[PDB]
């Protein structure tokens, strides 16, 4: 026989972790350092750029930490990109850039500092140092840009990861998020340099266009077999040559009307679906009935 480890004494001495740690959502060691600022600042506002990627769409938020709970200043989602002309690929690197640019324009407009920080109107994947009060820069007296810090969460921070695509879009939108180009696609760990052309290709989905052409040719070689890859891409007449101009148009559309979202039906008592919790007396009555039934059989 094997000794039981999870005995009664095991549960008495157990100390559950934090709820978001048990659920595997929050890394509290990183969260503590991220919401920590100098005590000499006396709680002056500090913001996080939260980038979360699901299997379907991309979530980007501007968040300020509070004791009652984190408050969201502005949010942008990749499923609103169809309102600007991006119907497909709402998860790829190009969509990550557009989600970041959408959040930056939405945040700057809400703070009234739009048209004061235009960012980079035309993207080229080139890294520029971010103006922050931390660095001494040129000691320029010009107004500083809105500042947030990237919050990748539990995401693995590899080179070319989509979390840094949202970063690149946000900085190109006028927000000052401190960063180095080490994790942008096209950056070379050897010789410590960033290739802006490779980075620019991913921003406009050149890699997606090349793969779509490659998949289309393979599907053309054999019509019989059904290809799951790019199924909705090919159902529409999406051409690889039109992808770069579609994202360029979307960037211009985002910069013109950042507040535009998906159209709303705009129509109401809620229909309850919850199961009623049994009262204490009923649970006791049910248990009393069960023992009575067993007693009858004897």
């Amino acid at each position: 026989f094997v000794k039981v480890v999870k005995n009664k004494a095991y549960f008495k001495r157990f100390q559950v972790k934090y709820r978001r740690r048990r659920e595997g959502k929050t890394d509290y060691h990183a969260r503590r350092q991220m919401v920590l600022q100098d005590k000499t600042k006396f709680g002056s506002p500090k913001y996080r750029l939260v980038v979360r990627i699901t299997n379907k769409d991309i979530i980007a938020q501007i968040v300020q930490a509070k004791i009652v709970g984190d408050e969201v200043v502005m949010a942008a989602y990749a499923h609103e990109l169809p309102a600007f002309g991006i119907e497909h690929g709402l998860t790829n690197y190009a969509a990550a850039y557009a989600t970041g640019l959408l959040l930056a324009r939405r945040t700057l407009a809400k703070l009234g500092i739009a048209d004061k920080f235009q960012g980079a109107k035309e993207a080229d994947g080139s890294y520029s140092a971010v103006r922050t009060k931390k660095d001494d820069e040129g000691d320029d007296e010009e107004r500083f840009p809105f500042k947030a810090i990237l919050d990748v969460g539990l995401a693995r921070t590899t080179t070319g990861a989509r979390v840094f695509g949202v970063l690149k879009g946000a900085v190109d939108g006028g927000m000052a998020v401190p960063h180095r180009p080490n994790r942008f696609p096209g950056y070379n760990k050897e010789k410590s340099s960033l290739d802006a052309k490779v980075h620019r290709d991913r921003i406009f989905g050149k890699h997606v266009a090349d793969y779509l052409k490659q998949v289309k040719e393979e599907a053309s070689s054999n019509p019989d077999e059904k290809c799951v890859q790019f199924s909705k891409y090919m159902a529409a007449k999406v051409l690889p040559e039109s992808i770069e101009g579609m994202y360029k148009k979307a960037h211009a559309a985002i910069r013109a009307d950042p507040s535009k979202s998906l159209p709303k039906k705009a129509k109401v008592a809620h229909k309850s679906y919850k199961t009623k919790k049994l009262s204490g007396a009923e649970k006791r009555a049910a248990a009393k009935a069960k023992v009575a039934a067993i007693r009858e059989r004897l």
Binding site: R32, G43, A65
Partner: protein, 158 residues
């Protein structure tokens, strides 16, 4: 034999409570400490950086200095015939905002509210009467208080 190091005799003092282990939470990090505030100096054993000496654990003082990660607290300490104002340097995780003036602050705010209500024709709340005054008592049930034989047999074990 016995030694006198910095952390001598702190086996139970610098220890977490049962099932309450862990590093300080976000609300401690988000708490704002200002110069002139009242703070309780309670050492957090999971943060072995900037801990107060064991004497200052459980003492309440006034903040005199705020630094990026640290708090300067003035603490009274009796030595021989006088009490010295000792300034200790600790990390922010080892200070809690003191509620030692909560009752006094509420008393001041109640007076302002009462004064404003009295100033402009408002009905003051009724004054509480003392419970030590006399009065007639009507008992619903009356029982006899006595020592019984059962009391003596009930205190015998086995």
């Amino acid at each position: 034999v016995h030694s006198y190091g910095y952390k001598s005799g702190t086996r139970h003092l610098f220890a977490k409570k049962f099932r309450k282990h862990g590093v300080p939470s976000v609300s401690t990090i988000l708490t704002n400490i200002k110069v002139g505030d009242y703070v309780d100096v309670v050492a957090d054993s999971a943060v072995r950086e900037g801990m107060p000496h064991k004497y200052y654990h459980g003492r309440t003082g006034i903040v005199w200095n705020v630094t990026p990660r640290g708090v300067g607290v003035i603490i009274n300490k009796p030595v021989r015939t006088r009490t010295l104002r000792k300034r200790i340097c600790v990390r922010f995780e080892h200070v809690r905002k003191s509620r030692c003036q909560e009752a006094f602050k509420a008393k001041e705010h109640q007076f302002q509210a009462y004064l404003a209500a009295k100033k402009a024709g408002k009905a003051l709340p009724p004054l509480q009467k003392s419970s030590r005054l006399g009065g007639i008592v009507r008992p619903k049930n009356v029982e006899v208080l006595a020592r019984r034989v059962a009391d003596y047999e009930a205190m015998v074990p086995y």
